[PDB]
Every structure is written in C-alpha cells, then in structure tokens.
Amino acid sequence: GSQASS
Amino acid sequence: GSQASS
Amino acid sequence: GSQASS
Amino acid sequence: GSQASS
Amino acid sequence: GSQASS
Amino acid sequence: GSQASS
Amino acid sequence: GSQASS
Amino acid sequence: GSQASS
Amino acid sequence: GSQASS
Amino acid sequence: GSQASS
Amino acid sequence: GSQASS
Amino acid sequence: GSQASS
Amino acid sequence: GSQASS
Amino acid sequence: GSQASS
Amino acid sequence: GSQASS
Amino acid sequence: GSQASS
C-alpha cells in the first residue's frame, strides 16, 4: 500500500 | 491500496 | 482501492 | 473502488 | 476537478 | 485536482 | 493535485 | 502534489 | 511533493 | 508499503 | 520532496 | 517498507 | 528532500 | 526497511 | 537531504 | 535496514 501527503 | 492527499 | 484528495 | 475529492 | 475509475 | 483509479 | 492508482 | 501507486 | 510506490 | 510526506 | 519505493 | 519525510 | 527504497 | 527524514 | 536504501 | 536523517 502507498500513502502520499503534500 | 493507494492514498494521495494534497 | 484508491483515494485522492486535493 | 475509487474516491476522488477536489 | 475529480476523476474516479473502478 | 484528484485522480483515483482502481 | 493528488493521483492514486491501485 | 501527491502520487500514490500500489 | 510526495511520491509513494508499492 | 511506502509512505511519503512533504 | 519525499520519494518512497517498496 | 519505505518511509520518506521532508 | 528524502528518498527511501526497500 | 528504509527511513529517510529531511 | 536523506537517502535510505535497503 | 537503513535510517537517514538530515
């Protein structure tokens, strides 16, 4: 699973 | 699963 | 599953 | 399933 | 704009 | 803009 | 912008 | 911007 | 910017 | 699993 | 910027 | 697993 | 910037 | 596992 | 900048 | 495992 926050 | 927040 | 928030 | 919010 | 495909 | 594909 | 693929 | 792939 | 691949 | 925060 | 690969 | 914070 | 590979 | 903080 | 490989 | 802090 991939989580990306910006 | 993929989560992307911007 | 994919979640995308902007 | 896909969720997209903008 | 939001695009969601499943 | 948000794009979500699954 | 957010892109999420699964 | 956030990109998440799984 | 955030990129996450799995 | 991959987590990326910026 | 953050890049995470797994 | 990979974690990247910036 | 942060890069993490596993 | 890889952790990278900046 | 931080690079972590495993 | 690899940890990198900067």
UniProtKB/Swiss-Prot annotation, chains A, B, C, D, E, F, G, H, I, J, K, L, M, N, O, P:
**Localization, UniProt:** Virion; Host cytoplasm; Secreted; Host extracellular space
The residues forming the signal peptide are none
Q: Per its UniProt entry, which superkingdom is the organism in?
A: Viruses
What modifications does the entry list under PTM / processing?
ADP-ribosylated. The ADP-ribosylation is retained in the virion during infection. Phosphorylated on serine residues by host GSK3A and GSK3B. This promotes the solubility of homodimers that would otherwise aggregate. Host phosphatase would dephosphorylate the protein during assembly at M bound membranes.
**What family does this belong to?**
Belongs to the betacoronavirus nucleocapsid protein family.
Q: What does this protein do?
A: Packages the positive strand viral genome RNA into a helical ribonucleocapsid (RNP) and plays a fundamental role during virion assembly through its interactions with the viral genome and membrane protein M. Plays an important role in enhancing the efficiency of subgenomic viral RNA transcription as well as viral replication. Attenuates the stress granules formation by reducing host G3BP1 access to host mRNAs under stress conditions. May block host chemokine function in vivo, facilitating viral replication and transmission. Acts by being secreted into the extracellular space where it competes to host chemokines for binding to host glycosaminoglycans (GAG).
* Quaternary data: Homodimer, homotetramer, homooligomer with RNA. Both monomeric and oligomeric forms interact with RNA. Interacts with protein M. Interacts with protein E. Interacts with NSP3; this interaction serves to tether the genome to the newly translated replicase-transcriptase complex at a very early stage of infection. Interacts with host NLRP3 and ABHD8; these interactions disrupt the association between NLRP3 and ABHD8, increasing NLRP3 stability, ultimately leading to increased inflammasome activation.
Tell me what this protein is called: Nucleoprotein
Organism, by scientific name, is Severe acute respiratory syndrome coronavirus 2 (2019-nCoV)
Instruction: Write the lineage as a comma-separated list.
Output: Viruses, Riboviria, Orthornavirae, Pisuviricota, Pisoniviricetes
Portion of the parent chain present: 179 to 184 of 419
